[PDB]
Amino acid sequence: YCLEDALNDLFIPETTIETILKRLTIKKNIILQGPPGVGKTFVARRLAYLLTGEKAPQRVNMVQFHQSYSYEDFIQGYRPNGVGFRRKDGIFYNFCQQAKEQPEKKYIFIIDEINRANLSKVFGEVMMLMEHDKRGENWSVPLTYSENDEERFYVPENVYIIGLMNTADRSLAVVDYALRRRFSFIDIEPGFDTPQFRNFLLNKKAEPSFVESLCQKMNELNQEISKEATILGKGFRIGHSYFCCGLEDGTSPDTQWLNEIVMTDIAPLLEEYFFDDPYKQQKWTNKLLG
Amino acid sequence: LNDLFIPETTIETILKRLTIKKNIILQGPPGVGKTFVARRLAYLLTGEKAPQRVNMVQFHQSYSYEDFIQGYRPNGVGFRRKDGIFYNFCQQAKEQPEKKYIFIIDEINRANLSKVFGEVMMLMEHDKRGENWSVPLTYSENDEERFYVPENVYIIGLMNTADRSLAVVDYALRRRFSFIDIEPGFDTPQFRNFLLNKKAEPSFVESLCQKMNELNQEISKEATILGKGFRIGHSYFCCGLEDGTSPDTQWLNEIVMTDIAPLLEEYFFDDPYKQQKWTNKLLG
Amino acid sequence: YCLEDALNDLFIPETTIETILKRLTIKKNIILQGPPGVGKTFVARRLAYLLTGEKAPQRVNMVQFHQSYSYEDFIQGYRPNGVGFRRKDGIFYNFCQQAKEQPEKKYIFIIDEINRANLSKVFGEVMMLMEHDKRGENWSVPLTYSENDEERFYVPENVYIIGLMNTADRSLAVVDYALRRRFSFIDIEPGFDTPQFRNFLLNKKAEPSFVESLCQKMNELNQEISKEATILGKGFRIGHSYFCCGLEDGTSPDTQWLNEIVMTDIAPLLEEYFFDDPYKQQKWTNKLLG
Amino acid sequence: YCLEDALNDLFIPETTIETILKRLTIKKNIILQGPPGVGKTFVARRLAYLLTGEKAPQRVNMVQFHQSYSYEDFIQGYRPNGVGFRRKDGIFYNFCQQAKEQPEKKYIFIIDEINRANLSKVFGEVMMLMEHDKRGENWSVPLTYSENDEERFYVPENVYIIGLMNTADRSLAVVDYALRRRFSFIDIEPGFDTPQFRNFLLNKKAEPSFVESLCQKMNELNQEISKEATILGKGFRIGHSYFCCGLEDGTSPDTQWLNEIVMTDIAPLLEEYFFDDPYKQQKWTNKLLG
Amino acid sequence: ALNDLFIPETTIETILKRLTIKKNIILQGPPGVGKTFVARRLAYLLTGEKAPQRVNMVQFHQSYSYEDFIQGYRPNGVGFRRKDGIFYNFCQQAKEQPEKKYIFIIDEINRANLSKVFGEVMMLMEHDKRGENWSVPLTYSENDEERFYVPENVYIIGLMNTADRSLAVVDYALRRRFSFIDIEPGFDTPQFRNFLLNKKAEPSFVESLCQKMNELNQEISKEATILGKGFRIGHSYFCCGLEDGTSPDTQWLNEIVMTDIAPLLEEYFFDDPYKQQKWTNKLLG
Amino acid sequence: QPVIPVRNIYYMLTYAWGYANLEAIPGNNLLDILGYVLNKGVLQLSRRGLELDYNPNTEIIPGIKGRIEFAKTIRGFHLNHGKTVSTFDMLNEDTLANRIIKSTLAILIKHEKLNSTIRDEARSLYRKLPGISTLHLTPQHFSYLNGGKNTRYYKFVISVCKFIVNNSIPGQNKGHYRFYDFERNEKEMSLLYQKFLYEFCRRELTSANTTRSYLKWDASSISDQSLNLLPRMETDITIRSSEKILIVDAKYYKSIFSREKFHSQNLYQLMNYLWSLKPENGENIGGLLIYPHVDTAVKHRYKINGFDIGLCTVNLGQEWPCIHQELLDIFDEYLK
Numbered sequence A, C, D: 001y002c003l004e005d006a007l008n009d010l011f012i013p014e015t016t017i018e019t020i021l022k023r024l025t026i027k028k029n030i031i032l033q034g035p036p037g038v039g040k041t042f043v044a045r046r047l048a049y050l051l052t053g054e055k056a057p058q059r060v061n062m063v064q065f066h067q068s069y070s071y072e073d074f075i076q077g078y079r080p081n082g083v084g085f086r087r088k089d090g091i092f093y094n095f096c097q098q099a100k101e102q103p104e105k106k107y108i109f110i111i112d113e114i115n116r117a118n119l120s121k122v123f124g125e126v127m128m129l130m131e132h133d134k135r136g137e138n139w140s141v142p143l144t145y146s147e148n149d150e151e152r153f154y155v156p157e158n159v160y161i162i163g164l165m166n167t168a169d170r171s172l173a174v175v176d177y178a179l180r181r182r183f184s185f186i187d188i189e190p191g192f193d194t195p196q197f198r199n200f201l202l203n204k205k206a207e208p209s210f211v212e213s214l215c216q217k218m219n220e221l222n223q224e225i226s227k228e229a230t231i232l233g234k235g236f237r238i239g240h241s242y243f244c245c246g247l248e249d250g251t252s253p254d255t256q257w258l259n260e261i262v263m264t265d266i267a268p269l270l271e272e273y274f275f276d277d278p279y280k281q282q283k284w285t286n287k288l289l290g
Numbered sequence B: 001l002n003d004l005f006i007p008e009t010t011i012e013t014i015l016k017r018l019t020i021k022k023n024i025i026l027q028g029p030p031g032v033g034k035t036f037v038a039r040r041l042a043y044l045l046t047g048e049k050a051p052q053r054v055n056m057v058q059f060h061q062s063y064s065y066e067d068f069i070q071g072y073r074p075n076g077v078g079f080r081r082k083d084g085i086f087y088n089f090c091q092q093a094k095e096q097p098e099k100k101y102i103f104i105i106d107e108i109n110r111a112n113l114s115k116v117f118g119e120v121m122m123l124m125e126h127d128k129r130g131e132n133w134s135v136p137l138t139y140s141e142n143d144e145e146r147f148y149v150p151e152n153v154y155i156i157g158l159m160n161t162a163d164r165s166l167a168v169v170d171y172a173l174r175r176r177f178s179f180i181d182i183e184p185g186f187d188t189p190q191f192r193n194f195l196l197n198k199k200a201e202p203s204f205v206e207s208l209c210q211k212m213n214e215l216n217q218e219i220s221k222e223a224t225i226l227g228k229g230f231r232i233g234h235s236y237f238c239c240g241l242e243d244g245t246s247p248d249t250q251w252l253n254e255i256v257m258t259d260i261a262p263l264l265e266e267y268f269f270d271d272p273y274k275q276q277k278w279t280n281k282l283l284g
Numbered sequence E: 001a002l003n004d005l006f007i008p009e010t011t012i013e014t015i016l017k018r019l020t021i022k023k024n025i026i027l028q029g030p031p032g033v034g035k036t037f038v039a040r041r042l043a044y045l046l047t048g049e050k051a052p053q054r055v056n057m058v059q060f061h062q063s064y065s066y067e068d069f070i071q072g073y074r075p076n077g078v079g080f081r082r083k084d085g086i087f088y089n090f091c092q093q094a095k096e097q098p099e100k101k102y103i104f105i106i107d108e109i110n111r112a113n114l115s116k117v118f119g120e121v122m123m124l125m126e127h128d129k130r131g132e133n134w135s136v137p138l139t140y141s142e143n144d145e146e147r148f149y150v151p152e153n154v155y156i157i158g159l160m161n162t163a164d165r166s167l168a169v170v171d172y173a174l175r176r177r178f179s180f181i182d183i184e185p186g187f188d189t190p191q192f193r194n195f196l197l198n199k200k201a202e203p204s205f206v207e208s209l210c211q212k213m214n215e216l217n218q219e220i221s222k223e224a225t226i227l228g229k230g231f232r233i234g235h236s237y238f239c240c241g242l243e244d245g246t247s248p249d250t251q252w253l254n255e256i257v258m259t260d261i262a263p264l265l266e267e268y269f270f271d272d273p274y275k276q277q278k279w280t281n282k283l284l285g
Numbered sequence F: 001q002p003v004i005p006v007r008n009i010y011y012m013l014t015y016a017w018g019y020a021n022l023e024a025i026p027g028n029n030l031l032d033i034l035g036y037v038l039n040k041g042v043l044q045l046s047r048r049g050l051e052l053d054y055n056p057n058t059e060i061i062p063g064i065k066g067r068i069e070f071a072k073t074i075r076g077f078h079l080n081h082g083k084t085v086s087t088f089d090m091l092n093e094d095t096l097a098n099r100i101i102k103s104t105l106a107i108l109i110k111h112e113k114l115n116s117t118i119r120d121e122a123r124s125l126y127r128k129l130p131g132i133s134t135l136h137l138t139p140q141h142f143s144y145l146n147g148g149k150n151t152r153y154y155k156f157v158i159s160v161c162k163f164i165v166n167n168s169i170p171g172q173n174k175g176h177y178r179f180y181d182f183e184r185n186e187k188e189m190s191l192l193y194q195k196f197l198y199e200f201c202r203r204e205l206t207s208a209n210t211t212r213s214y215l216k217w218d219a220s221s222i223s224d225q226s227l228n229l230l231p232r233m234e235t236d237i238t239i240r241s242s243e244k245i246l247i248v249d250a251k252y253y254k255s256i257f258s259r260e261k262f263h264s265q266n267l268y269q270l271m272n273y274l275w276s277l278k279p280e281n282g283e284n285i286g287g288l289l290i291y292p293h294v295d296t297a298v299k300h301r302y303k304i305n306g307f308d309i310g311l312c313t314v315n316l317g318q319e320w321p322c323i324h325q326e327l328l329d330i331f332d333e334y335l336k
Ligand SMILES: Nc1nc2c(ncn2[C@@H]2O[C@H](COP(=O)(O)OP(=O)(O)NP(=O)(O)O)[C@@H](O)[C@H]2O)c(=O)[nH]1
Pocket: A009, A010, A011, A012, A035, A036, A037, A038, A039, A040, A041, A042, A043, A164, A166, A239, A240, A241, A244, A245, B122, B127, B172, B173, B175
C-alpha cells in the first residue's frame, strides 16, 4: 500500500495524517476524537496499511467495544468449551502472539467506540504495559488467570493501538486521567473547508457556486455550536458524512437534493441541539434553503 | 396501498430513503399503525407477501446483547455459545443475497440501544456492509471468524414518542437512522373513505375530525411538555368495527372512556377538570 | 546495586527515598500516591533492588489491580480442572511461601493501581496480618478455603509491600480507613522545580532559559490547579513524564517540540480539566506556547 | 496467665477491662466497637488467655471476616473433589466439638472486621443458637446439609464469641440488625489521655512536656471530629497506635519522629476527612508541628 | 352467579365487552374486594360452562421469573432437563381446543418485572399479534423446529391492587397491553343489601352500614395525594362470617371492626391515633 | 418589615456555592426562581447527557456474563439449573447524584406554593426518568457526595437541591410542602453573606490574595497553656496585598435596615483580631465593617486605637452589576 492511494478520497488534511503518523510511531497509542461523520472508522483501516506500508488485513485486527465487553473476552478468561470450562485466550492476547512471530512487521489493533466500555476493567493489566517505554519482556507481568508467576505477558514493541471515540456524548468520556496519558489525543475536524471535499463534489458534476455556498453555510453553523461551549462544545459539531454518501448513482448534488437531506436528518438533529428555541431551528434551516 | 391512512408521498419518501439509506426509524405516537405500515411496507420491497423473510421483535428495558446477537446459554448438557436471532437472521439472508430480508424493531426507545446492538452499531451503515468491514465479535472464540451485515438487510425502527427518556441521548445512532415522523392522519381521505364505506354518516366523519384535531392542537400547543409525538393515534377506531357495527356516536362514546380517558389522565395528569372538559367536548 | 546507580537518573529528591526506607523498614507496607507521570511505576522496580541490595527479579513480584482481582485470585480460590474444579493457591500465597523459604533475603510484592479494586474483598484475612507487628507464626491464621485439617497462613516478617495509587481519580480513593492505617502514604511531587529534572534536559542539548521558562510556566499552572479543590485538587497537577520521553533519537527540545506536546496531549487535558470556559484553556495554552 | 503481665503494658483503663469480663462471662457474645489503632485486635488475644487463665492456642481461635466468608466454610459445606462433592465440617463446627470435650474449660472465638461480611450469610441458622440463653442440648437443631435430622449442632455454653468492629466507615452508620440483638457492644476509647500510654512514652526516653502537648492537641483534634456526625462521627477519631510503633530501636520521641508520622499517616488522612476545607488541613497539621 | 356478585351489573357487561375485543385486561381495586372471586365467577361466566380446568391462576412476586412461567432447565436425578412452565404447558392445552376460551389469572402483577418474566412473549400476548403467523423461537428452544405462539382463544386477566401508597405510577409495559378498570367497593349496591336482608339483617342496620362505610370511604378518598380513591375499604370482610351460620347483628359488626378495619385504618393514616379513635369509635356507634 | 428583593439573593447563593436569564420569570418569590433554575437546569444536562456510572452487579443469571464467580456458583449449586453467579457492569443513571434530582423534583411538585407552569414542566421530567428510583433524602446522602466525582455542572444543581431539602417544611396538607421563609432569619442570611464575600473576593480581586486566616491569642495562662475555654477566633475574610492588609467582619442585622441607635456589636470582635494579628512585613493593618442596607450606601472612616477602620453599607436591591461595581469600588478605596 502507499500514502497517495489513501489521500485521493480523504477529506482530512495531509498535515493531520503526518501529525498522526508522527505521534503514532513515537507514542504507539493514539485516540482520534471528533463528532460522528468525519471518517474516523474510514481512516483507521487505511492508516494501518500506510503504517505497515502493506495492505495486510491479517496483521490488522479491528473491533468495536460496547458495554457488554470484559477482560475475560478481551485478554484472558475462563469460558465453557462444553461440559468442562477452559481458559480462553482473548482476542487482544491472540493478536499479541501473532505480532511476536513477525517482530519486524507492525501489527495494529483498532478499537472503535472505545469510550463506551469500562476501559479500566477491560484493559487492566494492559493499562501499564501499553506505554511506549514499558513494552518488552523487561516489564513482563503475570496475569490474573495465569497458572503461576512464571507465566507472564508482555506487549511487543511493534504493536500500535488506534482508538476512535466520538465527542458527541459528554456522559461517556475518557475521564480516567491516568489512561489519558497513555493515549495521544488527536482532534479531528469536520473538514468542510478542504479542496478534496470540494473536488469530490465537482467530480460529481456539481456547481462550484453551490459548493462554496455550502461550505460557508456549514462553517458558520458549526461556529455557532462551538461558541456555546457550556451547552454544546465543538465536539458536537456536524460532520461531512451526511453530504458524502448517497451520490454513488451519479445524481448531481443540486439544491433540491440538499433540501431533502436537511428535512430528513439535520432538521430533527437541530431540534435536539436547540430544544428550547424553535425560532433558532427555522433560522439556520431556512438559511441553507435561502 | 389501499387501506393505509398515510399520504402516498410519505411512503414514497420512505421507500427512497429506505432503499438508499438502508436504515430508518418511524417515530410517532401509539395507534398510528406503525407495525401495520412496516409489515405492509416490508412485503412491498420484497415484491411478494413473504412473511418468513420478515422478522419482528419488541425491545424492552431488560433486552440484551445476549439475546440479540450472541450469548452464552445452557443446552441440555451445559453452557454453549448460542447464535442470537439477528446473527441467525443475517445468516439467513446471507444464504440468499438477491432477495431482501427485513427486520422490524418495536418499542426501540426503551432499551439502551448502544448496549444491545454493540458491534453492529457501526456495521449497520449502508456503506459498511461486506466482508471488508467484518469484525470479530465479543464472544468469538477465534479472531479470524467475523460478522458482517449483508447488503440485502434493511432495518426499520418503530419508536413510541410518548416516553421520552432524559437518560441517554445519542446523536451518533441518529446518523445511522434517518428519522421519519408520522401524523395520525384523521384529515386524510383514506381514513375517511374507509368509514364512509362502512355505512357511516358523511357528517359524522366530518364531525369527528374537527373534534379530535382540536385536542391534538391543544396537545401540540405546549411544545416543552408535549408535542406531535404525544398526540393521539387513529388505530383505536380501526379495530372493533369489522364485525359489522357501523359507526355511531355511542360507538365513539364506548372508545372515549375505554381508551382515550387513561391517555388523557396520563397526559393531563393532576388536572381532572381538563379531562372532564376535553372528554365531554368529544361526546357532543 | 546501590543508591548511586538508582538515584542517577531519578528526578525525585533524595529526601523521599531515605524517608521512604525509614517508613518502609519500620512499617513494611506503604503507598506511593501521586498523579501519573512522576515515576511511581518507574522508581518502584528500582527500590526493590536496594533493600535486597542486589538486582534480582526472583525475590520481587509485580502486579496490577484492575477492579476484577478477587480473593479467589489473590490468595485462595477454586479453578476448573478438566472435568471438575480444583483448589488453587493464589499468587500472594504462592509468593509468601517462597518468601518464607529463605527469611534472610528480603522479598517485595508490588501492586500497581491498588486504588481500583475493593481491597477489603481482595485481601480478606491478610488485611490484619500484613502489618509489621502482627507477623510471624504467632499470628498464624487459617484461611477460608483452607482444608479442614488445621493449616495456617502468616505473613513473614521479611515481606515488604508497596502500593501505587494514582491521585487523579477521586472516586477511586481509599475510604476503608481501617486499611489506610496499615499503609504509610508517601506523597510524590511532580518534580519540575528540581535540578535533576532540569539537568537531564540540558545534558540532552537544551537551552537553560527555555528550560527555566518551561518549569516556570508549569509550576504556575499547577498552582492554579492547587488553588482549586472542588474538582481539580492538589493531586491532579501535571507530572513530568510527558517531557521526559520522545527525545531519545537526538531531537533537541525547542518551542516547536513544546508546541507539539501542548497542542497534542496537554491541551486536550486542560479542556477536560476545566470544561467551563475555553478562554482559561486558550490562556494557559498560549502561555506555554508564548 | 497473670494480669500483671497482661494489663501493665496495656493502655486501656482497668475499669473497662473488668466490665468487659463481666458482660463476657454473663452474655458470651461481645463486640468491641472502636476506630482502628486502639488495640481491638491486641486486647482480644490477651483477654482469651485471661479467662482461660493459661496460654493455650488450641482452645482459642482467631478469624477475620470478609465478603467471601460464608456459611459453607464457617460451619458446614460441600467442597468438590476432582469430580465428586465431599462434605466438609467447617471451622466453628470443628471448633465447638473441641469445646464439647472440655465443657468446663473456657473456649474463645475471635471475629475481626465483622461488619464487612453479612452475619446472616455466614451464621444463618446458628444465630438462633448463638444467643446466650438458647444454648445447650435442649435447643439443638439439625443442619441444612446434614444427611439426616439426627445429627444436630448446639453452641456449648462454654464458648464465648468476640467480634472486633471498626467505626470508621459510612456504611456502618446503618448497623446490621443481627449484631445489636445478639451481641453486646462496647465502646473502646482512643485513650491518649491515659496514664499508662504516657508512662510507656516516658519509659522510652521521652520529654514529659512534649508528651502533654501532644495529647492535648490530639484530644482537642478528636473533639473536632466528634462534633460532626454528617461526614465524620465520633467513631472516626484517631487511635493511639500510630505513636506506639517505630520506637523498638530506642529512638526517642521528638518533633523529627513526630513529623514523619504526621506527614505520612495523619496529614493525608485529614485530606480525606476534610476535603471541603483544605485550609482546615493546614490549620491542624501546622498546629501539630508547632 | 350474576346475582351473587355485589358489583353493578353494568360494570359486568362493560368488562366482557372489553375483554372479548381487547383480550388483555387488568383489575385494580382495594384489598378485600373479592378480586380473585370476581375473576373466577367472571371467568366461568365468559366460558358459560363453569369449568375450573380451563382456568389457571398464578400469583406474581419479585422473584418470579421466566423459568417458572415459561421454560427453564431443572435438575434431573443426574444433570438437568428442560422443564415446561405454566404458560407454555397451559397454552398447548388450549391449542387442542381452539373454540374453547381459556383464562389465565395473574395476581399481584405489578410487583414483578413483567418484562423479565415474559421475555419474548410480552409482544405475542398483545392481542393484535396472535396465532400461528406470529410464531417466535423461545430462548431455550435450542432447535428451530418448534416455535411458541399464543392462540387467539387465550384471555388474560390480571389482579392488581391500589392498596399501597409506596407504589409509584404503573409500569409502562402494562399500560400499552392492558385496559385498566377500577372496581368500586360495592356497599351501595342492592345485591349486597339483598345479601344481608337474605340473612335477616335489620334494614336500619343495613341502611346505616351502607351510609357508615360510605362516610369513611368518602373521607379516606377525599385526600388527593397520599390516600386516593383506590384506598377505600372493600366489602369482602363482611361476607365471610355470616352464612357460616351466624346471623347479622351489631355485635357481629363490632368484632369485625376490631378484626380488620381498625388496624387497616391505622395503616392508611398512620399519623393520628385520635383520628383513628374518632373513626373507629364512630364505626361502632 | 423590609427584606431584600428575592431575585438578588440568588446571585449571592451563586458565589456561595462557587458555581442565565431571570428577567423572564414573573414569580418574585424564591422557590419560583429556584425551581425554574433547576427545572431548566436539568434540561441543560440531558442535552449533553447525564452521568452513567458503572455499577457492578453480582447476580444469578441463566448464562455467562462477564466474570463468573466460581465459589458462589458451586456452593449454591446454580450450575444444575443452568445458572451462574457472574459479575458485570450494568450502565445506569441510577447513581446517587441522579437519584437526588428526582427525589427533589417530587418535593418541588408537592410544594403548596408554586407557579403552575413550573409544576407542570417538572411532572413531565419526573415521568421522563423511569429507571431512576425515588428516595427519602438526608444530608447524609449529600455527605457521601462531597467527593465530587461528578462534573462541575452537577455540583451546581446538587447545591440547589441541598437548599430546597433543608428549606422544606410541611404546610396545610400531610403530603404537600411549604417553603421556608429564609429571608426573615438573620443567622442563615448572615452566614450566607459571610460566605458570599469570601468566594466573591477570590474571583474579582485577582490583584490581592484572599484567604480566611485563623488567629491565636497573645495570652499566656499559668493554669492552662491551651486556653481552650477562650472563644474560637477565625476571621470572616482577610484580603491581603503587598501594600496593605485588611480584615473584614460582615454580618446581616435587621435593626440596621431601618434608617437612631446603631447595631455594631460585631465590632468588638474586630479589634481583638487586630491585636492578635501581628504583621511581619509591617506594611499596615486595616479593618472594615460592611453591612447590607436597602435604600442607600454610606461610607465612613475612623482612626480609633492607632488603626484605620471603615464602616460602610451597600444598597442591596439596587441592581446586580452596579452592586458588583460598588463592591469593587469599595474595596479599592480601603485596599490602598
Ligand atoms: N468518500 C469519502 N467518505 C468519507 C470521507 N470521510 C468520511 N467519509 C464517510 O463517512 C462515513 C463514516 O465514516 P466513519 O469513520 O464511520 O465516521 P465516524 O465519525 O466514525 N462515525 P461514528 O462516530 O458514528 O462511528 C463513511 O461513508 C465514510 O466513508 C471521505 O473523505 N471520503
